[PDB]
Ligand binder design. Sequence first.
Ligand SMILES: N[C@@H](CCC(=O)N[C@@H](CS)C(=O)NCC(=O)O)C(=O)O
Ligand SMILES: N[C@@H](CCC(=O)N[C@@H](CS)C(=O)NCC(=O)O)C(=O)O
Ligand SMILES: [Ca+2]
Ligand SMILES: [Ca+2]
Ligand SMILES: [Ca+2]
Ligand SMILES: [Ca+2]
Lengths: 217, 217
Amino acid sequence: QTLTLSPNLIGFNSNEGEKLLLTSRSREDFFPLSMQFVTQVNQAYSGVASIIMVLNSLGINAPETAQYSPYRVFTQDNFFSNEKTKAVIAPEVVARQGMTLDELGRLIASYGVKVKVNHASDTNIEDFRKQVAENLKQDGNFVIVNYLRKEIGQERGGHISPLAAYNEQTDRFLIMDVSRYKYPPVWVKTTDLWKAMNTVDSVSQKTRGFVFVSKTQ
Amino acid sequence: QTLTLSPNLIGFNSNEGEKLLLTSRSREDFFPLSMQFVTQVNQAYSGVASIIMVLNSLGINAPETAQYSPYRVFTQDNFFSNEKTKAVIAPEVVARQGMTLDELGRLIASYGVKVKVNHASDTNIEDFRKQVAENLKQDGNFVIVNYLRKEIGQERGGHISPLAAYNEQTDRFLIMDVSRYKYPPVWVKTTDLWKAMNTVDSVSQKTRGFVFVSKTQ
Ligand SMILES: N[C@@H](CCC(=O)N[C@@H](CS)C(=O)NCC(=O)O)C(=O)O
Ligand SMILES: N[C@@H](CCC(=O)N[C@@H](CS)C(=O)NCC(=O)O)C(=O)O
Ligand SMILES: [Ca+2]
Ligand SMILES: [Ca+2]
Ligand SMILES: [Ca+2]
Ligand SMILES: [Ca+2]
């Protein structure tokens, strides 16, 4: 039960979508993110799924729980075991209204990793293409985006999901969509994704945007 | 945050493992499996995680539950919502002792899908390489392997995980290891994987092996 993609998007679930990855020259992040790819456990945890993909990909030290002990890994359930994390915003609130861009950043920063929040309002499409594309060539850092689905031709509201690769020939980014029951990963034209982050989240009264994540040293 | 690999195995989490994928001509399965890649929810559910990766990739009509409704998708928690699945072996039993190859086959078949169970004792490495390598070239069917982790230099017992791709130059198979907190995906020599399948499961007193899955056309 997958939803159908608007003509403007190229699904990863297609030959075209696979070739956009095999031809892309900015994709170093796809392999680790794919290894950690996860379904948001409820329809408002897209930010939590996205964070744990990134933190697990960065290999930073993970929570110690009964679940997988002795093994340690970020999961959507144990992400909030960090008291500074709940302090930002409680899990039962995220389970209702999700998380804003600034909150996403603080929730990542609660685990001591380096974050840079970019509101669409404080930048422009060129430095986003330039900077994001650069990140996608490098290990040890990642990109998460927060965007209004409606503006790239999907249903519907604000979403969060990491990016895995950029296709230089088509000017499209690959979104590793954590709503896996709903949409496959899609290749979205920078034009559409920009429009999509350049939207005001009523919750924050601030624009959506994108966040760079890396380790502090 | 995983265990270190034995030298005989090339992790997907390396340059070597990444290009073993890019230079394989038997990999059509990797893309849809990668999109469904999950962590087994407890340390005995590797069979259940493997099945749902395959059923979700096959676009088998999925359970209808509250969790993701209106969207329909296989999860480890809703796989046993089908009464004939539970009849094969109860979730509470799988959660303790996992599943044998034979039970793996019957659990898949309980969803009306076409399954061919191959115990190692009734075939041989050469027809395993040939038939799996060709399944990895075709859409609409998938391969799950059951194997003793020791025989490939991993810790430790019988495991289950789907196969994504076969790299002809090296004669290695990519295991999409659902124990994601413990090991990354690994490229394992065909000979090594045969050794591991050709072992007797004390639970079944039968050899381990591999399973082909497809839609009932
Ligand atoms: N207020 C943020 C919320 C971002 C967010 O967390 N969205 C959640 C729902 S509140 C999600 O998981 N959505 C899945 C989807 O859009 O399909 C926004 O509008 O951008
Ligand atoms: N009895 C089967 C069990 C296969 C199985 O279900 N393994 C479970 C444990 S009982 C598992 O999830 N193992 C994870 C791992 O070995 O990494 C065998 O030995 O092959
Ligand atoms: Ca790398
Ligand atoms: Ca990067
Ligand atoms: Ca295909
Ligand atoms: Ca196949």
